[PDB]
Amino acid sequence: TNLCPFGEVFNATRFASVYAWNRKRISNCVADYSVLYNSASFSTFKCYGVSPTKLNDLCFTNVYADSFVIRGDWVRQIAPGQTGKIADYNYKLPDDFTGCVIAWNSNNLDSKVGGNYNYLYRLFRKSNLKPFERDISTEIYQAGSTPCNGVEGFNCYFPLQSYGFQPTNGVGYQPYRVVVLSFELLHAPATVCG
Ligand SMILES: *[C@@H]1O[C@H](CO)[C@@H](O)[C@H](O)[C@H]1NC(C)=O
């Protein structure tokens, strides 16, 4: 009977950074996706392996929603088979993805004033993430001749960097909130339905 907790995902006070992104799991509820597709707010809402006008017919073994903030020029990396620092080192979707990516401009709800809130992404890593791997470690990264094995210095870097949004200005570099819905089809009792 109960409506699913999408309000706890889409209307939260602050969304996470793109390293250390939030994940919500959704179960034992009715998921009406019609109020998502017919909401006016969304700048992108792209679905893979399901079509949005049919989500209200389907039932899923379990549902996940992942949420974070990125610049409007990075949202193209939030798709299967993409490449770049976000897709490699911060958040990766598998090549065989069943789910939808939803994004909207948040420059009214965030970045509205002087200073900043501390949004960080990982810029350096020794190898790519696996699909849905999350990495929150902040050990020094080596980037040159000889190990530093300690303090920051010549050819060693702290792995995180700030996004550098334009100061309540610009055009493409503004903040976009993202929610990624991922749907399971494992042969067990269907915990979410339309
Ligand atoms: C977010 O809040 C608005 C305004 O209260 C509401 O219309 C919308 O349904 C909420 N989002 C979800 C996913 O329910």
Pick one of 1.20.1250.20, 3.40.50.10210, 3.30.70.1840, 3.60.15.10 as the CATH number of 7-186: 3.30.70.1840
Q: How far lies 55's CA from each of 40, 101, 149, in Å?
A: 18, 14, 51
**CA-6 nearest atom, ligand 1:** 13
Residue 20: exposure state from Cβ atoms within 10 A (0-12, 13-18, ≥19): middle
CB 92 within 8 A of CB 131: yes
Q: Where are the domains of the chain?
A: 7-186
Experimental method: cryo-EM
Give CA–CA dist 66/160, Å, rounded. 20
> Does ligand 1 have an atom closer than 6 angstroms to the CB of 3?
no
CB 90 within 8 A of CB 19: yes
Q: CA dihedral defined by 24, 28, 34, 37, rounded to 10 degrees?
A: 20
Resolution (A): 3.4
Which residue from 97, 92, 72 is spatially nearest to 82, judged by alpha carbons?
Answer: 92
Q: b/e map of 73-107 (b: 16 or more CB within 10 Å)?
A: ebbebbebeeeebbbbbbbbbeeebebbbbbbebb
- Cα–ligand 1 centroid distance for 91 (angstroms): 26
Give CA–CA dist 171/96, Å, rounded. 33
Give CA–CA dist 152/154, Å, rounded. 7
Q: CA dihedral defined by 191, 46, 48, 32, rounded to 10 degrees?
A: 20
Q: Which of the 8 DSSP states describes residue 3? A: B
